[PDB]
Amino acid sequence: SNTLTIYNWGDYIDPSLITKFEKETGIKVIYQTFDSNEAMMTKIEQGGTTFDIAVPSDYAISKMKEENLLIPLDHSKLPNEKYLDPRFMDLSFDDDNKYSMPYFWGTLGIIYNKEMFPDKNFDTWNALFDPELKNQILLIDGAREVMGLGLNSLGYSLNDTNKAHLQAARDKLETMTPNVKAIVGDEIKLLMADNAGVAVTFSGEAAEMLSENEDLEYVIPKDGSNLWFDNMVIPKTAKNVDGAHKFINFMLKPENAAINAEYVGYATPNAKAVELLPKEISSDERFYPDMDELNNLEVYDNLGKRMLSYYNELFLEFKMYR
Numbered sequence: 001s002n003t004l005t006i007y008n009w010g011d012y013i014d015p016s017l018i019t020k021f022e023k024e025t026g027i028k029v030i031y032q033t034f035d036s037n038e039a040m041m042t043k044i045e046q047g048g049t050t051f052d053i054a055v056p057s058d059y060a061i062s063k064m065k066e067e068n069l070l071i072p073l074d075h076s077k078l079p080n081e082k083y084l085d086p087r088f089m090d091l092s093f094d095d096d097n098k099y100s101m102p103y104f105w106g107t108l109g110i111i112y113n114k115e116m117f118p119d120k121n122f123d124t125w126n127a128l129f130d131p132e133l134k135n136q137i138l139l140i141d142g143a144r145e146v147m148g149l150g151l152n153s154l155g156y157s158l159n160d161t162n163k164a165h166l167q168a169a170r171d172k173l174e175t176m177t178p179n180v181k182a183i184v185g186d187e188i189k190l191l192m193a194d195n196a197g198v199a200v201t202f203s204g205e206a207a208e209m210l211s212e213n214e215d216l217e218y219v220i221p222k223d224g225s226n227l228w229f230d231n232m233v234i235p236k237t238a239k240n241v242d243g244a245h246k247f248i249n250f251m252l253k254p255e256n257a258a259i260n261a262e263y264v265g266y267a268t269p270n271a272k273a274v275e276l277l278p279k280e281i282s283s284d285e286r287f288y289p290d291m292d293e294l295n296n297l298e299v300y301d302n303l304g305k306r307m308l309s310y311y312n313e314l315f316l317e318f319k320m321y322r
Contacts, residue, residue, distance in 0.1 A: 004243040005030045007040060007051040009230070010186045012104070014263035021250050027243050035185045036142055038312060044069055050237040052244040055103050058229045059144065062093040062302035070099040071234040077245035080252030085271040087291065088229060093302070100231035101248050102269035104261070106203035106287075107297060108145055108226040113197035115215045122219045125153035128198070129172075133179040138188045138199040143315035144300050145226065146173065146183075149200065152224040159301045163310075170314045177322050192216070202228075204266030207287050211265070218286050220297070227297035229269075 006018075010033040018029050032051070034040040037060035044054060044064065056064060064070050075081065081101065088102045110122040116136075120127055128137060128149075139146060148158030150169035160166065181196035188199050194213045199205075206218035232251065234244045250256055257273035267287050268274055274282050282288055302308070 001240050001243075002026070003028045003030060004053070004240050004247060005032070005051050006053040006247070007032050007034060007043070007235075008053075008055045009033065010035055012055070012264060012266075014260050016263075017251070017256055017260055020256070021247060024250070025243075025246055027240075027246065029247075038143060044235045044237055048237060049239045051235050052238040052240045053247055054233050054235050055230050056100075056233060057300065058091070058093040058231070059300040059302045059308075061100050061231060061233060063305070063308065064233070064235070065094070065099060066302065066304075069236050071236055071238060071241060072098050073101070073234065073248070074245055077242070078249050078252065080249050080254075083252060083254050083257070083270050083272040085269055085274075088269040091229065091299075093229075093299075094231065100233045101252060103230045103232050103251070104204065104264070104266035105227075105229045105269055106266055107220050107289075107294075108140075108149075108200070108202060108228070109206060109218050109220040111192065111199040111201065111206045111209055111216055111218050113192075113213075113215050114217050116197035122198075123221060124223050125149050125221050126223075128179065128200070129153070129176055131178070133198060135179065135181045136196045136198050137176070137179050137181055138191055138196050138201075139180055139183045140188070140199075140201040141183045141185050143312045145200070146318065147311050147315055148226055148300070152221070155223070158224070158226060158298050159303065161303055161307050166310065166314060170318060173318045174321055177318075180322065183319055202266075203287055204264060207265035207284075210286075222296065225297055227294055227299050229299070 004027045022029055037057050084102055090096055094100045112122050150173040151158050151160050154172055156165050188201050189205050189209050192199055192209055210216045232248050238244055254270055254272035257268050257270035258276035261268040
């Protein structure tokens, strides 16, 4: 058809690139946001003819593969793939990029106000359980994120499928509850803006936050955290498959990738776009770390429908205690 329907995370594109795309292709873009991979998957699983593009994380791509929910990409319609950094390609969630193309990548970490907590060390997930942090923490509303930090706080993998370990992680996270002001998503950056003094959320949200408030700092705990990749896919709900390839190729153009990274604040996977960014952005090693610095991070795995649903049930219980 002549309409393209995009499903993406909240606060995760420069709207001016959608305008630019529409003007350049004559395609009309419809754009719906989601707040988690779990919400996105639920909707895509209902089927019908809905979305031409979705932007799932790593494990969700592998899960959507398992469910036969993705359309293989025509790489001949994607010549801008050559500009991507190969370190972000051919990763185990989507071998040979058969189904997906890198959008943004990042980490998970702690954003804290250095003036509020000058005596604290957020180098460990265990700093978050300090009883001086009563009602101080804004936690990302994400099951893999929060179960993962609970597991990591115990010294376990964020992909642990030992049920005894998962129950231990839920019990641990219960002990954090007095320190939790709210469990929220995109609101965090606004709630922390200097218009609670600790947040756990994604690197790009932290980049935006730190740029507006000098007193904030972002640290990735040294006892392990998450490294993630969000990639564009064409779900089987698609009607405008050609248009979808056009959008993907458009977003792989370096000037578009640079504009997007500059506006949104997340790290680009596009090796030519990095050059186009202002050096104050690209030189920031909290957001553009050296690959050695990432050697203690773990990428979420698709644990299967049953175990992923159990993570979701445990996270929901944590959410309900309070």
